[PDB]
Amino acid sequence: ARRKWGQKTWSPTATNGGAAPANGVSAQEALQIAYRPMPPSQTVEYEEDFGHNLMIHREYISKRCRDRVSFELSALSYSNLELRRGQEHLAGIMNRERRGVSVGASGAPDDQVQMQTDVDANSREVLSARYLFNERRLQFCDRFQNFFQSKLENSAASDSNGHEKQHLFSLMEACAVIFGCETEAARETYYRMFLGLDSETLLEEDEALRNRIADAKLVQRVLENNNLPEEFEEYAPLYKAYITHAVGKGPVASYDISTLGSTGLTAERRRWRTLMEKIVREDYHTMTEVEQMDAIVLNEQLHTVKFFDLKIGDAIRDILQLLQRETGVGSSVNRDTPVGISPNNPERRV
Amino acid sequence: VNPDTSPMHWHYNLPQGMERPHSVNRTFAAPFQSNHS
């Protein structure tokens, strides 16, 4: 209220707790600190009542900068699709943080495992890409490998496979890291890092399948009340999309084909998680042929997953060596084919 | 932050064996190129 640049007014101190009592704050003081005097016309007040406690959310966005605030900072959704997409985007970010803190630096002594990497600066080849394991994980790896060597070597000629071959090495190490963990949150984080297939991903896929079975039943009922393909479940979304475009509002029909493989993909992914869990439980001594095929397919997939960052690095390094080569066209000395002519031109020679 | 992968004197009590072989000349066959004619 009419403040000067240099002049200040000194005011009394209410109590010994200072502006912010470090010792603590009582319930009514916290209630006042929560329900601060904001202009209500721009504040959302919200509750959530559950078993033991209430949760309150009071959020205010000033009228000043609704034209400049980034769409993410405001997080305002003026539509239903905007609302859902913001809900799920923020949910993804929050879950990412909450689950990465379980295996990050804080982590736990037996959970957090690091990777050692070394790449040549001239031949651009990975001379080291391994995991830093403890004794328990190394002993699990040794048990796995010695058990498989006792039979895979006798059964396999190894004419081209080699004698020192590591059988299902990627599956073995991806299972060893999980085996060495001591917390379910960390084990699930490592699962998600391994081709997803963690508990939450599989539950979301189950939710999608359970929502699609209802639609398949709905389309079956509609067709009966008013020839079908072998596995109708995978086409139910497209069928309902067209039925709604025909009868209902349906301002749009669907063409997303990504859902057709879903039944088989989900069955295979669940098979994969079950196989990984049994290998963690050490029950790899007895394997059916379906499980052996599952392991063969999964091992090849996990071996490419861990090399994404290394391939990014290899690409970046390839760009560098590209910029270091001679300018212009190839010098006359380091050139084999003639310039200005295709090497296969029938008039190759003069 | 996002963690980084950890990359890799020598005591006289160690074996003093050579750590690893090096083949640079056989990998890169450099043609003879001299400034003088």
């Binding site: 690091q114 001379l127 890409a129 830093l132 190394l138 | 005591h11 009590n13």
Partner: peptide
């Protein structure tokens, strides 16, 4: 070939002074 350079290796979590390195104890 790739599996030669890609093999998990033991890591001394604690500092050298705190934990006498295994290769140093051997020698």
């Amino acid at each position: 070939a790739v599996a030669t350079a890609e093999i998990p290796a033991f890591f001394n979590e604690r500092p050298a002074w705190e934990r006498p390195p295994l290769e140093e104890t051997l020698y």
